[PDB]
Ligand binder design. Structure first.
Ligand SMILES: Nc1ncnc2c1ncn2[C@@H]1O[C@H](COP(=O)(O)OP(=O)(O)OP(O)(O)=S)[C@@H](O)[C@H]1O
Ligand SMILES: Nc1ncnc2c1ncn2[C@@H]1O[C@H](COP(=O)(O)OP(=O)(O)OP(O)(O)=S)[C@@H](O)[C@H]1O
Ligand SMILES: Nc1ncnc2c1ncn2[C@@H]1O[C@H](COP(=O)(O)OP(=O)(O)OP(O)(O)=S)[C@@H](O)[C@H]1O
Ligand SMILES: [Mg+2]
Ligand SMILES: [Mg+2]
Ligand SMILES: [Mg+2]
Lengths: 438, 267, 494, 118
């Protein structure tokens, strides 16, 4: 039937939040936060005040979700009243955010009704004396994602001038900064903190298990009659949440104890619904939740236990042999020569007490040695893998490290998985299990 | 949905999730998606086999290993997106923007904003999949570059007719765990078994081991002309089962090391 | 053409001339009277600066409600006669009145901690002596705002000063030779006195200190008629950057603004409330709109001890007037939203701002949230901190190896296996609930909560690719981490 | 490093193809795929590594693997020339094992010396 195919499509676009903006789901634990964001936007767009504020919470804490919700709800009532500027501390720099404001200023002002052209000292002084300076004004709303990278230790020019428009400009300038850092005010300079209006509002957190039950209840309830299966779906999902010993309420409880983030459970429900062929299987799959065990097995199937279980016998024997040399060493370090010496005296002691097991040569374990390097079982000794930013990754590419230049079998390595962890994962029926203990 | 799931051999969970996230409707598709697996785990195979079984949803295939720095990676995005849309919609009048003019992560956003507004006469919402195939294999890679591509969706216009969608492919799972709190969906491609490597290697290579001239030349020239295709297929299949059972402990669960030891030892 | 090795396709170059001012009249005697000359001293620039008021105008306006507390927040803004800087007004005004009246040149240096009224009262000095000059008791002058943090480059102050003097757009290396020829060579009969304000002089001198010397050396000239009011933050910025023999040669005055006392904060806050405190409004009971002198005659008093404790707390920390005007603006909107929620006006007998509204406005900027954040984390995230705090009392090394934290988490579920909470969670934390997933090395969401605490700023982690020997600090304190973990019920018993 | 090997290699082929030809290009391995679509003739590029005993073998291993990605383009062929001053046995202990399996589909050892055979 096409009724189920329309029952999937709404129930899946409720799980992405792409409902139109009067049907969008606002959970009850972040209503008092979105009412505080609602008050700030519409006494700056309707009532033309100029205050700034920083939103702060973790990643995937509905900071950009609530700002996109509040502007879209003011989009439909007050379209002509405001232009919106949004920057982002990842893709913008100190130099590039000047071009990003002026490009978005001139293209938002065409839709209601040049600035962006010239040198960078020209394009910055034109957006100043535009902004710094019965008919009413256009209010300009700024949105910052990762304002904490604009609040670096060095200069902080761009945060100085925008907070200087909150205090002194005759243009009403609303500024949202979405950061993650709890100590965001200590990144700011003394001049930049003094201009800022000191309002830093903290995104709410899930406090109870019943907050996640009510928020999954709001995500999986269809509030209109689109399909013949809507009432039959809604009475199934209310039985699965009223029963505390149900399997769906068991997977919510594991999320509350481990992740406590509803977007992580949201990625689990999405292929439980989209990979359901008919309503008979879609009603069954949320009763049993046998997909969420298969999903959670996949997400964690090549982390470090799933890579150790995908090894051959020589790859496991070299991994054990390098884990015994790393336990005797004081620095946890080993070579290819040290780990093949422990390997060959292990294969001797197997074949002496015992048909026989092949001892692979020095030239043949070299391929096994390099695969354990690229599967993150061995790391280079004092190694800095990825750098923080782009200049530190560029400085490291011009330096020629020592372990590159020394020969192959002399490189000191270290150990991702120690021998005491390596005894616990390998089963007791392996012939190499006796060698996971000194 | 309204999509076709192909039959990849030992990736039947991975293809059902791949059909679950990738669709033509942009409202029910995530703007980021990672396909993580290690080398040889069949994740460009089933990514390609999914898009061939679904021809009416559109893909731009980029390899970030032959682009080496972050700046050629931005320029190739601007080049191949507008080259895709010209073949895809020839009736739309457009003015070509120089892809070599982007030198910033923002100048990509401004160029993609300029490319997408002139396809505004299209009839419905359409998603173009920008497949960064091997994003972790970029040589100059750092921690602060992948969270610069997560957030491009928020800087591009929300009511455009063309919604770019990023599909990432990456290897090493220590790169992936740096971005765990972004909660963007990930499909894992674990390593194959010894029985999964042998079945894949025997359906991939028994075709070439017949059309190889060395087996072709010898059977007529040795003057033993008493054979069929079903013996031809079984003599090459039993070599592959014998070249694995000897050298599995040396190679491991590779595909590319087994493919080299076949053709070095088949003549 | 040739094959280029790299391309620059986004170069946008300004139309700025290269030849300085010393090469366009061929003689000092051929320089005309620069005051009676059209393009100097901003006699035509008043058309383009007023162009951008028309861009942000729209014709829609539908009766926005202006309640009782909206009028108070409008009057506590920093942009809206100043009581507590009187001796500092009389020092800057006396030093600048004498140099303009005598056709002299000087430099006034003024410093202080942020927010103490020094950018305000220098602008109030030059507004008083604009009004004195407009009455013709001192000659006419030209006033230039230079802000160091309103410049892209530090060298843009040369461009912007010479543009305000001459109306000419030159590069910076041509602007400082234009200014240096202007101040020492051009005669005093041909020029006009110039009062330039070098605001936020810290920002211009961070890289090369070539910019603070030039503005101060130009004031030592005889022919120059230049008054540099140089406002910065610290008092030793001239002597550190320039040296001891240079700062003695210039001979500038040196004023410091001390941060305000609590009694001076009261005469700033209550000075901006003289028109509204103890006054009567006309509030209709169906929209909420107030009108200063269906409708009640309500009135508005703000409590004087509320302004007292807002002044005692702000002046004891920093002493700036911004943090006290926006702790009373914040208190005025806390009182508005309760007035807005009781009657339900929305947006389209006596009201007061209590002691509890000001304390609520003041407590939220002084509290930390790292306590409240960590009591409401996962069990997994709180188990990470609780294992890290046990390691910092086994050693006190205050940066723990990350593999020592993993073995502690496993040992802590090892030992407390009789516990009622730990028996039922260890199945859902090593296999993640059901079977068919093997028992694993890290707890479920170990990469999630380690990245959750690094993103929050609670936790510092060094850069190592070996995920086991990597080190982990805290960034908050050991005390307020233990205070958050002795509140949680299940961790404090084990 | 590896990006300086490629930006010089893509500059040396784009400069030497405009010399034989009688717009600007990003110098990366996307010039190899656009070579027939911009010059009309197919390519045959030859690499001549000069002092390969003085180069580090982390960079040369990662550059051969980078050139391996140009075997999907149907109109190019690469040819490597290694001026090994000392020894072949020293080189195969330096490169990774999966690279030597790539170098062995067709290799040719040519003894080049003033001292060979006198
Ligand atoms: N405009 C939007 N409409 C609907 N859902 C959205 C929107 N923006 C984000 N979401 C979803 O909201 C959830 C989390 O909200 P976010 O706003 O992304 O959290 P966040 O605070 O922005 O995280 P950041 O930006 O990385 S710090 C995710 O499932 C997103 O897919
Ligand atoms: N399930 C499968 N069925 C059939 N052939 C497969 C399967 N998985 C892999 N192969 C083949 O084995 C080889 C594996 O290559 P890829 O799929 O490209 O590996 P990969 O996952 O992309 O790993 P990297 O990162 O590119 S080295 C190809 O020749 C595939 O055609
Ligand atoms: N004595 C005062 N009387 C009245 N209002 C004052 C007084 N001092 C400061 N203000 C107000 O508070 C604001 C603070 O401005 P200033 O203190 O002059 O700036 P500032 O001293 O340069 O601080 P910076 O820029 O960080 S060095 C002024 O704009 C006034 O609105
Ligand atoms: Mg965001
Ligand atoms: Mg691939
Ligand atoms: Mg100031």
């Amino acid at each position: 039937d096409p009724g189920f195919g329309s029952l999937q499509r709404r129930l899946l676009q409720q799980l992405y939040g792409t409902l139109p903006t009067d049907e969008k789901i606002i959970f009850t634990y972040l209503q008092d936060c979105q009412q505080e964001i609602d008050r700030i936007i519409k006494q700056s767009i309707i009532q033309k005040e100029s205050h700034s504020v920083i939103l702060v919470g973790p990643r995937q804490s509905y900071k950009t979700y609530l700002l996109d919700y509040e502007l879209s709800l003011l989009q439909q009532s007050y379209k002509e009243q405001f232009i919106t500027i949004r920057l982002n501390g990842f893709i913008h720099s100190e130099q590039t955010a000047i071009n990003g404001i002026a490009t978005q200023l001139e293209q938002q002002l065409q839709k209601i009704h040049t600035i962006s052209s010239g040198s960078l000292t020209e394009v910055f002084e034109k957006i100043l004396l535009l902004l710094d300076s019965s008919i009413t004004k256009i209010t300009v709303v700024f949105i910052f994602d990762e304002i904490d990278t604009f609040a670096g230790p060095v200069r902080q020019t761009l945060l100085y001038n925008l907070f200087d428009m909150v205090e002194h400009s005759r243009v009403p300038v609303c500024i949202f900064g979405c950061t993650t850092k709890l100590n965001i005010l200590e990144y700011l300079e003394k001049r930049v903190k003094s201009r800022f209006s000191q309002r830093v509002i903290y995104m709410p957190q899930i406090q109870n298990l019943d907050d996640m039950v009510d928020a999954v209840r709001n995500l999986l309830t269809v509030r209109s009659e689109i399909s013949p299966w809507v009432s039959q779906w809604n009475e199934t999902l209310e039985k699965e949440l009223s029963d505390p010993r149900s399997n769906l309420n068991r997977h919510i409880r594991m999320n509350f104890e481990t992740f406590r983030s509803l977007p992580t459970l949201k990625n689990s429900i999405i292929p439980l619904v989209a990979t359901s062929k008919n309503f008979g299987s879609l009603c069954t799959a949320i009763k049993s939740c046998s997909f969420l065990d298969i999903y959670n097995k996949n997400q964690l199937s090549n982390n470090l236990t799933g890579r150790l279980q995908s090894l051959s016998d020589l790859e496991l024997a070299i991994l054990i042999s390098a884990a015994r040399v790393a336990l005797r060493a004081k620095d946890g370090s080993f070579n290819f020569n040290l780990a093949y010496a422990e390997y060959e005296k292990m294969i001797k002691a197997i074949n002496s007490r015992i048909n026989t097991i092949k001892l692979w040569l020095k030239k043949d374990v070299k391929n096994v040695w390099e695969n354990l390097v690229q599967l993150d079982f061995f790391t280079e000794k004092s190694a800095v893998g990825l750098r923080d930013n782009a200049t530190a990754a560029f400085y490291a590419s011009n330096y020629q490290f020592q372990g590159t230049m020394i020969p192959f079998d002399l490189r000191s390595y270290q150990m991702q998985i120690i021998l005491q962890e390596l005894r616990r994962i390998i089963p007791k029926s392996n012939m190499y299990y006796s060698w996971t203990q000194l | 949905m309204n999509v076709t799931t192909p039959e990849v051999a030992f990736r039947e969970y991975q293809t059902n999730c791949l059909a679950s996230y990738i669709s033509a409707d942009p409202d029910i598709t995530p703007s980021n998606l990672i396909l993580q697996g290690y080398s040889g785990t069949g994740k460009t195979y089933t990514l390609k086999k999914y898009f061939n079984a679904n021809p009416n949803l559109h893909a731009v295939w980029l390899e970030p290993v032959e682009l080496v720095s972050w700046k050629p990676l931005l320029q190739a995005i601007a080049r191949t997106v507008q080259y895709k849309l010209k073949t895809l919609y020839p009736n739309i009048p457009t003015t070509d923007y120089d892809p070599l003019q982007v030198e910033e992560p923002f100048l990509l956003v401004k160029t993609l904003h300029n490319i997408f507004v002139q396809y505004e006469s299209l009839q419905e919402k359409t998603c173009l999949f920008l497949i960064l195939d091997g994003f972790d294999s970029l040589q100059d890679l750092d921690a602060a570059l992948f969270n610069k591509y997560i957030k491009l969706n928020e800087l591009l216009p929300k009511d455009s007719k063309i919604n770019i969608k990023f599909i990432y492919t990456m290897l090493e799972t220590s790169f992936l765990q740096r971005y765990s709190t972004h909660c963007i969906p990930t499909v894992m491609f674990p390593r194959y078994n010894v029985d999964e490597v042998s079945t894949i290697l025997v359906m991939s290579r028994c075709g070439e081991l017949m059309e190889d001239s060395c087996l072709r030349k010898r059977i007529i020239e040795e003057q033993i002309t008493d054979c069929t295709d079903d013996q031809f297929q079984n003599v090459a299949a039993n070599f592959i089962h014998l070249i694995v059972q000897a050298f599995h402990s040396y190679t491991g669960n590779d595909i590319f090391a087994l493919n080299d030891l076949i053709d070095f030892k088949w003549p | 053409p040739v094959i280029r090795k790299f391309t620059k396709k986004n170069v946008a170059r300004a139309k700025k001339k290269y030849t300085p001012f010393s090469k366009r009249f061929k003689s000092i005697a051929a320089i005309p009277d620069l005051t009676s000359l059209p393009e100097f001293y901003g006699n035509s620039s008043e058309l383009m600066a007023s162009r951008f008021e028309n861009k942000l105008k729209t014709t829609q306006k539908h009766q926005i409600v202006e309640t009782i507390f909206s009028k108070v927040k409008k009057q506590l803004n920093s942009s809206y006669y100043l009581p507590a800087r009187e001796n500092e007004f009389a020092s800057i005004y006396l030093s600048a009145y004498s140099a303009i009246e005598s056709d002299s040149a000087t430099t006034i240096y003024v410093a202080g901690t942020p927010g103490v009224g020094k950018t305000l009262t220098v602008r109030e000095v030059v507004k008083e002596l604009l009004s004195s000059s407009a009455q013709r008791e001192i000659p006419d002058f030209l006033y230039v705002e230079i802000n160091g943090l309103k410049m892209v480059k530090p060298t843009d102050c040369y461009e912007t000063l010479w543009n305000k003097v001459s109306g000419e757009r030159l590069t910076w290396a041509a602007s400082m030779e234009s200014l240096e020829f202007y101040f020492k060579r051009v005669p005093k009969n041909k020029k006009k006195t110039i009062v330039v304000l070098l605001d936020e002089l810290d920002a211009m001198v961070t890289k090369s200190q070539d910019i603070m010397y030039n503005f101060f050396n130009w004031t030592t000239y005889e022919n120059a008629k230049l008054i540099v009011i140089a406002v910065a933050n610290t008092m030793d910025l001239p002597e550190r950057q320039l040296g001891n023999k240079i700062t003695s040669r210039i001979g500038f005055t040196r004023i410091m603004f001390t941060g305000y006392t609590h009694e001076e904060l009261k005469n700033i806050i209550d000075l901006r409330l003289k028109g509204l405190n103890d006054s009567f409004f006309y509030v209709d009971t169906k929209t909420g709109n107030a009108i200063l002198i269906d409708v009640r005659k309500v009135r508005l008093r703000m409590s004087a001890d509320a302004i007292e404790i807002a002044s005692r707390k702000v002046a004891s920390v920093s002493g700036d007037a911004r943090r006290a005007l926006k702790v009373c603006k914040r208190a005025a909107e806390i009182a508005e939203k309760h007035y807005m929620a009781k009657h339900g006006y929305g947006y389209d007998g006596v009201q007061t701002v209590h002691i509890t509204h000001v304390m609520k406005a003041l407590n939220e900027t002084l509290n930390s949230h790292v306590i409240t954040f960590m009591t409401r984390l996962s069990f997994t995230a709180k188990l990470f901190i609780y294992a890290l705090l046990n390691l910092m009392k086994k050693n006190g090394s205050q940066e723990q190896e990350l593999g020592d934290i993993v073995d502690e988490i496993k040992l802590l579920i090892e030992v407390n296996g009789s516990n009622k909470f730990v028996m039922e969670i260890a199945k859902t934390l090593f296999q993640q609930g059901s079977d068919n997933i093997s028992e694993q090395l890290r707890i479920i969401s170990w990469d999630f909560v380690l990245n959750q605490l690094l993103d929050a700023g609670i936790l510092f982690k060094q850069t190592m690719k070996n995920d086991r020997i990597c080190c982990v600090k805290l960034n908050i304190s050991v005390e307020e981490a233990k205070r958050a973990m002795n509140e949680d019920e299940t961790l404090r018993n084990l | 490093n590896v990006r300086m090997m490629l930006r010089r290699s893509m500059y040396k082929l784009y400069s030497a193809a405009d010399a034989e030809e009688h717009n600007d290009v990003s110098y990366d391995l996307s010039l190899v795929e656009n070579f027939k679509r911009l010059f009309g003739k197919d390519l045959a590029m030859v690499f001549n590594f000069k002092d390969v005993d003085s180069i580090n073998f982390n960079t040369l291993d990662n550059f051969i693997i980078l050139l391996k990605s140009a075997f999907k383009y149907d109109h190019v062929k690469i040819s490597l020339i290694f001026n090994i001053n000392t020894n072949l046995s020293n080189i195969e202990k330096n490169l990774r094992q999966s690279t030597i399996r790539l170098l062995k589909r067709n290799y040719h050892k040519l003894d080049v010396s003033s001292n060979k055979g006198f």
